[PDB]
């Protein structure tokens, strides 16, 4: 039932987050998703007063769609490099289906609703990364 | 007043991060149109069919009503991780 939401520049560690997320015996299914930056540095601009709230609104909606246990959502900001972990979603449930589906949903909605914008520091200047129509479609299925 | 925040490309094109407007608009849309009408740059920034809006840090329809003290933000489609 508790939700951990963190938005900030600091790195996170899946091994550090997992124990808490997985602690409840009634939370028999634990799914995590880590997304890394996909060589140019990326800088993640964000709307600070909204990013945590938006992530929390997505988890609240997930909790109404699936019976979830602990959930953790972490999204980094600042300058990151390919290979760096940018986002972590941890979800638990009694059954795997709920856990997987909610993880997918949380990611799909994060990718279309959480106010972060990536810019790439290319040789010719900063360039904004393009939003993907595939994220829109993925989100629209829910 | 209503505080209007801009992000990313929108911010870049409008040329400010934030501004205040009187609460004389019934909806986000009415406000968007008023801001768009201030200049060609503002219209460009704030006329994209994919522009998003938030009111008090929630994403909303452009038909969302506005009220004094609200914080409105206009921004492009998001690109987080
Ligand atoms: Cl992905
Ligand atoms: Cl998926
Ligand atoms: Cl108009």
From Swiss-Prot, chain A:
One of its GO terms (cellular component) is molybdopterin synthase complex. Substrate binds at residues 36-38, 95-96, 111, 118-120. Pathway: Cofactor biosynthesis; molybdopterin biosynthesis. Its EC number is 2.8.1.12. There is a cross-link at residue 111 (Glycyl lysine isopeptide (Lys-Gly) (interchain with G-Cter in MoaD)). Changing residue 120 to K: 17-fold lower activity than wild-type. Converts molybdopterin precursor Z to molybdopterin. This requires the incorporation of two sulfur atoms into precursor Z to generate a dithiolene group. The sulfur is provided by MoaD. PANTHER family: MOLYBDOPTERIN SYNTHASE RELATED. Belongs to the MoaE family. This is Molybdopterin synthase catalytic subunit. It comes from Escherichia coli (strain K12). The lineage of its organism: Bacteria, Pseudomonadati, Pseudomonadota, Gammaproteobacteria, Enterobacterales. The gene is moaE.
Curated annotation (Swiss-Prot), chain B:
Pathway: Cofactor biosynthesis; molybdopterin biosynthesis. GO terms for molecular function: nucleotide binding. GO terms for biological process: Mo-molybdopterin cofactor biosynthetic process. Keywords: Isopeptide bond, Molybdenum cofactor biosynthesis, Nucleotide-binding, Phosphoprotein. C-terminal thiocarboxylation occurs in 2 steps, it is first acyl-adenylated (-COAMP) by MoeB, then thiocarboxylated (-COSH) by IscS. The keyword Nucleotide-binding applies. Transmembrane segments: none annotated. The modification 1-thioglycine is found at residue 81. The keyword Nucleotide-binding applies. Signal peptide: none annotated. GO terms for cellular component: cytosol; molybdopterin adenylyltransferase complex; molybdopterin synthase complex. The cross-link is not seen in all structures of the MoaE-MoaD complex. Belongs to the MoaD family. Heterotetramer of 2 MoaD subunits and 2 MoaE subunits. Forms a stable heterotetrameric complex of 2 MoaD and 2 MoeB during adenylation of MoaD by MoeB. During catalysis MoaD shuttles between the two heterotetrameric complexes. This is Molybdopterin synthase sulfur carrier subunit.
């Amino acid at each position: 039932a508790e939700t951990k939401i963190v938005v900030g520049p600091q790195p996170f560690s899946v091994g550090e987050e997992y124990p808490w997320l997985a602690e409840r015996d009634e939370d028999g299914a634990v799914v995590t998703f880590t997304g890394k930056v996909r060589v140019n540095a990326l800088t993640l601009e964000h709307y600070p007063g909204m990013t945590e709230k938006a992530l929390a609104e997505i988890v609240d909606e997930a909790r109404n769609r699936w019976p979830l246990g602990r959930v953790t959502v972490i999204h980094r900001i600042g300058e990151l490099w390919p290979g760096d972990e940018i986002v972590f979603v941890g979800v638990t449930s009694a059954h795997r289906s709920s856990a997987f589906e909610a993880g997918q949903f949380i990611m799909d909605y994060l990718k279309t609703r959480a106010p972060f914008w990536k810019r790439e520091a290319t040789p010719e200047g900063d360039r904004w990364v393009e939003a993907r129509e595939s994220d829109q479609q993925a989100a629209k299925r829910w | 007043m209503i505080k209007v925040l801009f992000f990313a490309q929108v911010r870049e094109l409008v040329g400010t991060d934030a501004t205040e407007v009187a609460a004389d608009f019934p909806t986000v849309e009415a406000l968007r149109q008023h801001m768009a009408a201030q200049s060609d740059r503002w219209a460009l920034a704030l006329e994209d069919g994919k522009l998003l809006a938030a009111v008090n840090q929630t994403l909303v329809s452009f038909d969302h009503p506005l009220t004094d003290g609200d914080e409105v933000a206009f921004f492009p489609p998001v690109t987080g991780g």
